[PDB]
């Protein structure tokens, strides 16, 4: 039911989405931890710097600097970027930022996973 | 394809704990560009990956050029019109090297492969020569 808009996996079948199943319809402010998470099986969280956008009918941006989280309020892009997904597969190769002038990132990865950087500019 | 004097890689920069560090050759003459660009992969390749890497090279030497290196093959890159012209503040003195700095567009983007846990830091530059954007 939630899932982020501007980080996805890179697999040998394509590009797979970290989606959670709200189960407790709780609100994408109360299980950002839960998508961190997710990312600490590919990076390195205590060394990274990023941002985690989740749609959960609307869209919230959140930054993660070396696992502390903050609230962001004003950014307005529209991930929409037409992109083509999976959701089976056999191995993660890499990781996919969306990064934009006003969010870049710092990744450290696990497992010698690759970091791919992707630009958006649209709004 | 030749070029003369000094040319700086503009898109791509050292993190070390003293800063920014920039490559540079300070005399390409009788050089040509594969050979140019190649110097630059080669030094890059002690912090990344080459063979799994995917990234694009932006050389200043009077005007601007455009390389990308696929996984150690490189090829020229016309028409494209970003300038990197953020001022920024570099070093030249260092100790360690913590990471890989790329500035990426929307017509470059980068699959990196780091070396000895060092970082990959992306930051992304809109400005172009005609766009309205630079300077």
Redesign the interface.
Known sequence: AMELVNIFLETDAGRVKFAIKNTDDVCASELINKFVELLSEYI?ID??EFYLVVKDKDIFYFKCDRGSISIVNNEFYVFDEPLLFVKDFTNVT?VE?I???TM??????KN??????????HK
Do not use: L
């Open positions: 390195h060394q990274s890499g930022f990064v934009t002038e870049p990132c710092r990744i450290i990865p010698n996973h690759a970091v791919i950087s992707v630009v958006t500019n």
